[PDB]
């Protein structure tokens, strides 16, 4: 006998959603919860309020779940209104993002389900920190979450980033603007390649009209924006270029019925009896018109308990601004036919990328070397970052293994120093170069046996696009 709201989505399978949650055995905790389904598909504020507090007036309701299709603003802030008006816990939402910003003061609320915008920026650095490729651009249009975003990527890009170049670029606001005028002055600086900003889908279609007008669409560039602008769903216009990779947390998240079970478990596990030090009996609210001063003592004890609760290998927790504390993460998705194909999974801090090189990127060379005396020194990697600072060279060494699987060009990129590497870093700037540096495997460098050559000359005679 606890009151749990449902999900009102105008499409889905409420049977799988019912069945998923009803196998979580919440005994050994205090009373057992319950569910009551209803549905709506309209997205105005008034229908939302007169349904939420109608259900509040009928049932002794503890908490509220909600998700409709893919509208973020048409839910957000309205929820912060009803939560602070009712002093009752409310789950995080699907069908809009539960993200972009829980900016109001959660001293009477708190609802959320999602990674923070900075945990997304940290994993966005570690992803581009898998191969090369330091932070290029700055967020140009006005996110409301801009000054924290840039002051966190600035405050981490200096005290712990492995030799990064400058950011000659700033923030404008082309909403009040007449058109393509000040966006023309920012398309010059904007060097190569870049990082895209946080904007809207319609205004991305706008800024891509300006970028197509100047010539930034092809041109050898890539673009990272973490999903919230254009990748909200499986729908994209054809005016998006094939460089427009983007990371989210979700293709198997909230909408899943096991996620629904997880959401049921977070509110329900935080029992009043589980609060053994403060065995208080919750007196739920009557209706959405009064009884707001009765929860002054109850909700503060509840605010401390939602953070790290233990579950059945699914320890979900929230920050003060409502995020995880180990959020569910996905990798960047890319394709070229209207374009999101899945490439990855991230949990704690791992990446386990599907390829060790980015496809779609002649002056690209492979170069094969050998570890030896004062010429090419091979040392191990940093145990916190993987890359190399002074060396700044992959040296993707292959492993010889059992004769049932191929070699390992995903073995960890051992540092390579010496005198020839310092020569190579000058010879690259002398004309125009691009490395693909890797080691020999048979270990028979500079040998001619009966018929053939081995080692570095062995990979010379096999015409493998080489230097030595």
């Amino acid at each position, epitope marked *: 006998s606890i009151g749990i709201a449902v999900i009102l989505v105008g499409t889905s399978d409420e049977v799988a959603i*019912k069945d998923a949650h*009803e196998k979580d055995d919440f005994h*050994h905790l205090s009373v057992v919860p319950r569910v009551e389904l209803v549905a709506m598909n309209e997205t105005d504020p008034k229908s939302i309020i007169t349904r939420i507090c109608d259900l509040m007036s009928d049932r002794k309701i503890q908490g509220v779940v909600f998700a409709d299709d893919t509208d973020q603003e048409a839910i957000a802030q309205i929820l912060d209104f009803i939560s602070a008006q009712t002093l009752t816990p409310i789950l995080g939402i699907h069908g809009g993002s539960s993200m972009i910003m829980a900016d109001k003061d959660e001293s009477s609320m708190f609802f959320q389900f999602g990674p923070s915008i900075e945990q997304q920026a940290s994993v966005m650095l570690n992803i581009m920190e898998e191969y090369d490729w330091y932070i290029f651009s700055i967020v140009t249009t006005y996110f409301p979450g801009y000054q924290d975003f840039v002051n966190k990527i600035r405050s981490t890009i200096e005290n712990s980033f492995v030799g990064w170049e400058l950011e000659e670029v700033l923030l404008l606001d082309m909403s009040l603007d007449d058109g393509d005028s000040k966006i023309q002055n920012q398309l010059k600086k904007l060097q190569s390649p870049i990082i895209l900003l946080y904007c809207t889908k319609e205004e991305a279609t706008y800024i891509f009209e300006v970028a197509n007008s100047v010539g930034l669409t092809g041109y050898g560039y890539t673009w990272i924006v973490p999903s919230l602008v254009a990748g909200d769903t499986d729908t994209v216009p054809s005016e998006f270029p094939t460089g427009l990779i983007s990371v989210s947390y979700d293709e198997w998240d909230y909408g899943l019925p096991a996620r629904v079970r997880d959401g049921i478990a977070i509110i329900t596990t935080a029992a009043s009896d589980m609060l053994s030090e403060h065995s208080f009996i919750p007196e739920p609210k009557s209706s959405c018109y009064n009884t707001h001063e009765k929860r002054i003592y109850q909700s503060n004890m509840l605010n401390r308990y939602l953070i790290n609760v233990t579950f059945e290998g699914r320890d979900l927790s929230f920050s003060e601004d409502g995020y995880q504390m180990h959020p569910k993460l996905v990798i960047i998705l890319l394709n070229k036919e209207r374009k999101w194909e899945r490439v990855g999974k991230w949990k704690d801090k791992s990446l386990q990328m599907k390829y060790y090189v980015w496809p779609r990127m002649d002056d690209h060379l492979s170069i094969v070397t050998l570890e030896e005396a004062p010429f090419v020194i091979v040392e191990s990697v940093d145990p916190l970052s993987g890359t190399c600072m002074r060396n700044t060279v992959p040296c993707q060494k292959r492993i010889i293994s059992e004769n049932k699987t191929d070699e390992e060009p995903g073995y960890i990129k051992k540092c390579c120093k010496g005198f020839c590497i310092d020569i190579l870093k000058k010879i690259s700037k002398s004309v125009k170069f691009t490395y693909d540096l890797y080691l020999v495997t048979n270990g028979k460098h500079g040998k001619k046996i009966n018929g053939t050559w081995n080692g570095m000359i062995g990979e010379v005679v096999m015409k493998r696009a080489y230097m030595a």
Partner: antibody
Amino acid sequence: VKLQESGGGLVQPGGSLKLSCAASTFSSYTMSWVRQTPEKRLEWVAYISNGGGGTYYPDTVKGRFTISRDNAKNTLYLQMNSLKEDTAMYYCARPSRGGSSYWYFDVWGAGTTVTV
Amino acid sequence: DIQMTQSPSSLSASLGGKVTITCKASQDINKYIAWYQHKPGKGPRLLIHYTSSLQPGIPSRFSGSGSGRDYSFSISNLEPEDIATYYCLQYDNLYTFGGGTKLEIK
């Protein structure tokens, strides 16, 4: 899905008779069953959740009763000890809408007797 | 746990009369009600939900009203296939039950 009881008896006065009720999806479905008085009262006997936890009784038969269930064979297990003054009929009842919570069944069993 | 007590002891009525039996629990139930009927040796049949919501296959012969912890349930227009005994259920804590009454025909 249908429920059929078995294991009926009170052949020892004050003994222990493990009765059962098999089902033919019952794994996500909790269980609680019923004895009947000579005044026919559908008094409760025991309580399990669907997941084996939540082992409880009402105040009539507390202190003597050993409780289990098996969702593989879709069966319950509880030995009747303090029905020794009754000529009761027992049936099994599977509450609707599943879960470790409880709702209103139409999914009841068949009905068998327990006699001293 | 919470325990219930129904009352009183009888459904003494003629063909098509009116009797009413009360759910009385030790604690507030918020209209947590059910109603069942069975022959001696046959097995229960559901009547009533939350808002006295009847069942498909169950006629409109059964109605009721009440709230909080006290509920009344009225039976009329009874055909003598309902030689039965009527019982009320509460589930605030895990399950709750009382005495209940049996039906006789005079």
